[PDB]
Amino acid sequence: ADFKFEPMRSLIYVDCVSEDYRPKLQRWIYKVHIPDSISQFEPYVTKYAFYPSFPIPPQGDRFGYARMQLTEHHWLVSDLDPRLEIKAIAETFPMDVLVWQGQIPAAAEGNPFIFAFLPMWWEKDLKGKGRTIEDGANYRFNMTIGFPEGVDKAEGEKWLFEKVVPILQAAPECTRVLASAVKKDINGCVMDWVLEIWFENQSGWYKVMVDDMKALEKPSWAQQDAFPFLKPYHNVCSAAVADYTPSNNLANYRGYITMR
C-alpha cells in the first residue's frame, strides 16, 4: 500500500528535572540518541535539530519550561503510521532517561512526553511580519498549550485570541507572534496550540508574560492562579531559544568527540 506525503514539523519539549542529571542526559542525547535516530529516519526526515534552552527565567517553572532543549524534526511521512513501527535496530533507551526528563518522578507524579506535530509553516502570523535577521537577536519563547479535559476547544481558542493575543500585540517588548494548531490526528497529543513569541531578552519576556498578564481574569477552568492558568508540564510546555543552533544533526554530527 501507498505511503502518504505528509510534510510536518514536530517539537519535543525536553526537560532536565535536576542539575545533577544534566551531564548524563546530555551525554545520552548527543552520544547515543543522535546516531540511533539518524540510523532510523535519515531517508524520510529532511532536518533533525536540537535547540538548547536558555537559562530558565523567573517563574519559568509555571510555563512547563524545558530545561534541556527543544527537539525538532521535519518529516516527509507520518511517524505514527503503524508500518513504521518495525525497525531493524531499536533505539538504546535506558529507563533512567525518563527519570532525568521527569517522565518518572523521584519515587511528585511524573510529567508526560509532549511530542507535537505541526505543518511545516506557521498558520498564523499575528505580529512582526517582515522581521529579518538583520533586525537583531531574538529571545524566542516557544510555548505549547492544551486546554484541560472538558473545556470546549472553540472556547479555549476564543479565550486565547480575545484575551491573550491582544496583550502580546500591544507590548512593544514583543517583536513577533506566530501560531499553529497542533495536528491532533497524528499521535493524540494533548496540546492544542503552539505559539512562538519573541522578545529582545528575558526581562522583556517577564514584563509581558508575567506582569502584563496579571490583568487577565482567571478562567473557570484554570489549573493555576496566574497565566498561563494551565498545569505545568502537562497542559503547558515551553522553552526560550536562540535563532541559531550548532546542533543541526543531519548536517553537522561527526561522532562524540571528547574534549582533551
Added chain:
Amino acid sequence: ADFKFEPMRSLIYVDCVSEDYRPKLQRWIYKVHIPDSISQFEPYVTKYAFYPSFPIPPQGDRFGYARMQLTEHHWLVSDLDPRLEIKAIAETFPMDVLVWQGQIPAAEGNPFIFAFLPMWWEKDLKGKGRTIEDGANYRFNMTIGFPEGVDKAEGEKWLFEKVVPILQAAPECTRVLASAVKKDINGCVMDWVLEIWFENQSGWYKVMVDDMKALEKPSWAQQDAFPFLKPYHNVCSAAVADYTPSNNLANYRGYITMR
C-alpha cells in the same frame, strides 16, 4: 489541509548590469542570500545551487544573457502555495539588489524570470547517450516566452519545426534538451526552457548567430535576428559549465574571506 507532492526544478536568470556592481551583488548572494534561503527551505528543497555564467559571448546581449549566474532549486512542494508565504525570518533584501540585477534602472527595467520545470527534461532532441567522458560542455541554457497575442501552439511549432532543425544540422551542437515551463505555478511569462550544448563559445556563435541567419523573421519578431524576442523580457540565457562548486546545501561553510 494536505500539501501536494510537487517535485520541480526551477531556474532563475541572474544578471549583473554593470561590472561595477559585481562585487556587491556577489557578496549579497554568497554572504546574505544563501543563509537566509537555506534557513527557509532546508526541509523541503533537496538541492540549491548556483551556476556562474561564462563570460558573455559576442551578441549574447541579444539573448538576455545573465551575466551573474543561474540559480537552481529542486523543490518537493510548490513554493507558490499561499501557506508558504508565512516565514519566521524574512530574507534580508536591499532595494539595491534590484538595481544590480537590472530589475530597476538607476534605460528600462528587466523582469525577474523564475521558471518552474519538472525535474526531468521532457524532450531529448539531440545527443542522447552523451557521458561526461565525452568531454567538457559549453552548456547554453535559454528560456523563451512568445509575445502577447502569439498563439502558443504556433510558437511551439516554430520552435520545434524551424529552430531545432538548425541545431540538429550543426555538428558543433552536441546536445539539445527542452521542457515546457510550468506556467500554473507562478505565472512566469516564459513558455520553454532549452539547453543547447557546444564545445565552446565559437561553436555557440557559429550556430546561434551565423547558422540562424537562415531563419526567416517571424511576423511577431521583436528584434531583427534570432532569437527574435525581446532581450531579458521574452528571452534569457546563460552559458555554464558542467560543474559548480556552489552546491549550497552540501558545500556552504559561511563567508570565509581571503587573507
Added chain:
Amino acid sequence: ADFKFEPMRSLIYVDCVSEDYRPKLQRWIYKVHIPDSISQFEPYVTKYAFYPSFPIPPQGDRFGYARMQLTEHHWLVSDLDPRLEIKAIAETFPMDVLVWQGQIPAAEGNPFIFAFLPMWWEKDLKGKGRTIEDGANYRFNMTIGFPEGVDKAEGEKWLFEKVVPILQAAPECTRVLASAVKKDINGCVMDWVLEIWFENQSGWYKVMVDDMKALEKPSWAQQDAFPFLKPYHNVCSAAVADYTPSNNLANYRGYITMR
C-alpha cells in the same frame, strides 16, 4: 502530469566473479559510478550507500553470494517512471563492468538483480527490540524468486511455514526480517527479501547449511540443498556489517588516492 510520492528502498546484489577483477570493479564503482549517480538523482534520492560484503562463507556460492557489495538506494519517486529515462548526462559504463560482475562471460551470464522494497520491513519474525548495544551482527541479506510455474502463494507458504521456523528455532539466529519485493516497479524476478542475523560466519553456516538439511527438497528445487534455487538467478545474498563508511550522499569527497 503529476509524479507520485513513492518512497522505496532498493537493493542491488553486486558480484565480483574473479579476484583479478576486484581492483578494476572497485575503482569503477568508487571513482566513476558514485559521481555519475549522485549527479543524476541527488534531488530525489535521500540515501545512497554501499555495504561491502564480508568474505564469502563456505558454500556461499550456492546462495548467489555477492562478492563485491550491496548497493542501497532510498527513493522518493519510482526510478522506472518512463519520464526519468531522460538524463542530460548518461552514466559512463564500460562493457567490462558486465564481465566483472558476471552479467556476461569473458560459463553462463548472471542477471542484474535490482529489488525494490518499502522503506520499512513488512514482517518482524525474530528479535524485535534488538538494539545496537546488544552487539555486532553478521547480517545475511538474501533475496529469492520462485522458479517459473511455481505458484507464488505456495512458495510463500513454504518460506514462512518451513524455512523461517528453522531460523526462529536456532539460538545462533538473532533476527529475522522480511519484505515482499515490489514486482510492479521493474519486473524483478525476486519475490522476497529477508535479512537474517547471526553472531558470525560459523553461526550462519550452522543454521543456513546444517540446520536446513532437515528440509524436504521441494519438487521445484533447482539444486539439491537449501536454498533449492539457482545461484545468482533465483537467489542472491550478501553478509554485511551494521555500519558502512560508504554513505555516499554524506561522506564522498572525490577519489583521493593513497600516498
Added chain:
Amino acid sequence: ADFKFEPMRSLIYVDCVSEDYRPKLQRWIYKVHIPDSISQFEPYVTKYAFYPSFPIPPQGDRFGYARMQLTEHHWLVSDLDPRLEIKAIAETFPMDVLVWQGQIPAAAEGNPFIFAFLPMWWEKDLKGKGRTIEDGANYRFNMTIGFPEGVDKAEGEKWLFEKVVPILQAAPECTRVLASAVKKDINGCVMDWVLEIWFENQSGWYKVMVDDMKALEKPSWAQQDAFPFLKPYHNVCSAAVADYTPSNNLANYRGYITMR
C-alpha cells in the same frame, strides 16, 4: 625570518554579565566572530571550539565563572608573534561585546580578558589516570588561577599542589585532576596555572570545592575569605563544561542558519 613551530592549546574564559545580554553576545559569537576567526587562522590553527558553560553553580561567582563559554584554540605558531599583527581583514568587533562580557561597564575596573596559553598536553596527571569515556559523563570544572602581585610563584605552587590538590585527591566525588603551567612568555597572561577537576555533577563540585575546602586555612595573600582566596574574574576564572561540544568550528560550521 623563520617562524617557530610552537604547538599550543589556549583557553579564553567568556563571561556574560547579564542574562539580558545573552542573545546579543551569543549572536555575535556564532554569526560574526566564527567566520572572522576562521578567515584569519584556518592555515595554522588545527582546532577551534567553543564549550558552552553549564549553569553557574552555587557560589560559582566566587570562582570567576564564565557564564557564556570556554573558547579553545590549537595553534601551530604563536599568535603573539608581532608579524601576525597584520591581517587583510580585521575582525568585526562592536565595543558592546566588552560590555556583554564585563570587560567594561555600560558607558581601572571591569574584568580583564583572560587568554591563557598552554602546551597541547597536560603537564601533570594527579588523579584518575586511565579514565575512559566508557566510565561515564563528566562535569569538567576548568579553573585558571594567578597569584596576586608580590606572592612568590614557587610558594603559590607549593600551596596549590601540597594543600589544595590533596583535598581533591581525598574526595571520592572528584574523578580526575589535571594541571598545566600557563605559558607566561606568550602574552603576559596573569594566570599561573590551569587545572581541570572532574566531578559526577554540580553537587559533587559543591561538596568538594566549597564544603571540603573550608578546611584550608586562609593564606596571608587571600583576596577573598574562602577558597579560592583569589579575586573573581581577575585572579581566578572557571567554567564547568561537558565532554562534548557541537561547536567544533573548523569541522562543523555551515553558516548562521536560523530557526523556522
Added chain:
Amino acid sequence: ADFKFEPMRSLIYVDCVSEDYRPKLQRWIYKVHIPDSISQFEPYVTKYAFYPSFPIPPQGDRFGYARMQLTEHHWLVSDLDPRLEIKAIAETFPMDVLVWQGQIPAAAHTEGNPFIFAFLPMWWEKDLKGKGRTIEDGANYRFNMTIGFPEGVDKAEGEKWLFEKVVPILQAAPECTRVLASAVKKDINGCVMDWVLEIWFENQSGWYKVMVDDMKALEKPSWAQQDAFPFLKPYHNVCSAAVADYTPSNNLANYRGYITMR
C-alpha cells in the same frame, strides 16, 4: 634527516589565453587537478583554494591579467625540498594545459608565458593603507599583482621606486581602500618576481581610475619594458588578478567530487 617547519602562502597566476579553452581548462582544474593535488599534499597543506578572476578590466592585458584564477596554497613545509619530488601517484597533466594557460603555443609552425609560482610568508609584511578594515566595511575588488624587476635592475632601487613613487599615488586616491605587500621568497623556487601587492578598490572603475589614469603621472623608468605603468613585460615580469573576498572553492573543506548539472 629533519624537515624544516616552513609555513608559507603561495600564489599561482592562472591565465586562459582564449575563451575557447575555458571549458577544457576549467574541467581539468576541477575534475582532475583538485583530487590529484589533495591526494599528494593533504597531510602538510592546511589550505588549498581557487579564487576565480573577475572579468578582465580595460587595459588589464598590460598587467599580465590571469583570466582563469589565482591558485592559493598554505604549506607547512617547502614543496621545493628535493625529498618531496617522490610521489606514489603523479598528477595527470596533459601538455594541452600549458597551451590553455599560454605557457606554450597551440600548434607547431615554421617563448610563451612563464609559470609564475610565488612563495610568501603567511602574513603580509607591509600594511600600507586601510589598516583596520573589516568585512563590515563592504565588498572589495581585490587586485593582487606580482612584479619582478628586469635583469640588471638593482632590487633596492626597484623597491625604492615601488614604495616612494607608486604607493603614494595609491595613498592619495580615495578610490583605493587597502594596500598590502610582501617580498617574494626567492630562495624557494627561483621565482623572478620580487613583490606581491594587493590593492583594493570598490570596483573596476576605481581600479582603472587609479591604476591607469592616476599612474599616468609617473615618469617612465629607464628600465621600462612598456610605455605605461606597470612598465613591466606582461605575464613575464608582471601578473595580476582581481578577485572577490570569498571563494566557494576552498578545496580541502568543500570538494565532493565532480558532480555534473542535470
Added chain:
Amino acid sequence: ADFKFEPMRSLIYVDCVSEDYRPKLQRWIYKVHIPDSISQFEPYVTKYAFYPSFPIPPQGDRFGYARMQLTEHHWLVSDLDPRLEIKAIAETFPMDVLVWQGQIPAAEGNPFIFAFLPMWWEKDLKGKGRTIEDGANYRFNMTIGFPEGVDKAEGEKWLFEKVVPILQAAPECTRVLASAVKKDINGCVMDWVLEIWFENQSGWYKVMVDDMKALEKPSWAQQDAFPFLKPYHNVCSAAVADYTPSNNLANYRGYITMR
C-alpha cells in the same frame, strides 16, 4: 620545553585471525576506536585513514598478511614523546581486541607492528610518473625486519641488489617504492617498508611467489621461501586499493547503522 616538528607517516598492520572475530573487531574499530583516536590527536595529526585489506591471496599467510586493514596516520609531532603519554580521556580498549588481532592467543602471539616513516618515500625504484589515469592498482605494502644478529647493511644489500631486480624485471609489477623505518621513534623491529604494485592478485603471485623461487635461501632465513622471514614477526603486509572511504578526519559521521 619545545616540541619538535617531526612530520611522519605511520602504518599499523591490523590482522583478524579468525572470520568469527571480524564483526566484533570491525565494530570496535569503527564504533569505538575512531572517536577515541580523533578525540586525542585531532590537533596534531593531519590525516587518519584505514585501508581495508583485499582478500588474503594464496600463500599470503607467509607474508604476515593483515586480514583486517592498514591503519595510517600523518603526524606533525612524535607520538612517542613522553609528554604525550598524558591524556584527559584514555581509549576504550577491551583486551579481546588483542585476541581478535592475534597479539594474544585464545602457543604464540604476534607483535603489534607500528612503523614510522617520513611522509615521502625515500626510494622510487620502478614506475616513476605513474598516474591514477593509468589504472587500478593492487598495492602490496610489505614491511620487513632482519632477524637478530643479521647485519643491517647486509640485509639492505640483499633487498636492493637481489630482491628488487626481480621486481624490476617483471612486467606484472608496475611500481616499487621504499623507505627506511624510523627506528629511533618506537623501537619497531622492522627495517624497511616497501610498496609493490600489481594489476591483480595473479600478478602478485606470479612475481612474489613464482619469480622469487630463483632467489637462493639466505643463511638467516626463518622460512624456506621468500620472504625468508617469520610471518607476523619479521614480515607483515597488506594488499590494498588506491582509495579508501575511511578517511576518518574528513569523512566520519558516527556509527550509523543499516536499516
